[PDB]
Design a protein around this ligand. Sequence first.
Ligand SMILES: OCCc1ccc(O)cc1
Ligand SMILES: [Cl-]
Ligand SMILES: [Cl-]
Ligand SMILES: [Cl-]
Ligand SMILES: [Zn+2]
Length: 315
Amino acid sequence: EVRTIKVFTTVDNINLHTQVVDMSMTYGQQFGPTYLDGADVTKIKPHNSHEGKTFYVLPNDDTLRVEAFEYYHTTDPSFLGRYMSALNHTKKWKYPQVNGLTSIKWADNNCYLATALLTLQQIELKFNPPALQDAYYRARAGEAANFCALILAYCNKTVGELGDVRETMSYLFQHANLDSCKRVLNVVCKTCGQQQTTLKGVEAVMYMGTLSYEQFKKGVQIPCTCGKQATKYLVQQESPFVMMSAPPAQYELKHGTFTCASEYTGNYQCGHYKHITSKETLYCIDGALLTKSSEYKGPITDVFYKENSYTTTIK
Ligand SMILES: OCCc1ccc(O)cc1
Ligand SMILES: [Cl-]
Ligand SMILES: [Cl-]
Ligand SMILES: [Cl-]
Ligand SMILES: [Zn+2]
């Protein structure tokens, strides 16, 4: 006797595709790799409780390929498996509200994710893939499991792997609309003269070398091809925020002079991130943990600043 149930397959969990499955064969034999809200059911035969449920599958026909790319903006064939594998874990994480922001209770080396998530909620940024748009809206409201799983998938990080905040923000910014952002820099060598540069998009909002937005406006010293030390300063800026990054070092954060910052303790390959936000006082959010202080000194790696338009007076 043949028994069947109706299920739906999906790539985006919005558009559903009716399927009738034979209860005597695995999902894998009928769809290929198949997932139920993160759980890999490829090797499992259908259960009666599965009737009417949605399963994620790979894009094995052109309708699914178009749906998958429209929703995720990626054609990496291993994306689904990485997203499903991460979601199995992030579904179990806790997402407390800390000082009005969605954070992440510490688990599985996820401090860099918590810091990035708290930072996103403090800067003006809209994502381009609907998958991130939708999941970020849910994360803002406190249901951040899908957003965190997607970040891990897009960044090619597995749960438990320690990531870098700057690298993660770089990935997230590539999937955001930063097209209006523009940066003009001037590099002044005493041997080689001037050289001005224009940066756009992600490169117009990120800098590596110094944490101070003010010193960037005054000038920082960098190598030259001739062997001398040349001075680089900010000519013009057009963006809603700027990110200043540098190798971790002792740095003093003063209330009211920045938006938020990433603190990193440890070494290159093993450590812990905390988040400092400047509100009515300085709050340090460490996953679910919250402390406050009037002044801050610590190993800072990233600082975020508000911006709209800046023009130098250094002519
Ligand atoms: O475009 C590939 C990304 C993807 C494919 C299938 C899914 O079910 C989910 C995501
Ligand atoms: Cl968005
Ligand atoms: Cl990383
Ligand atoms: Cl600021
Ligand atoms: Zn030179």
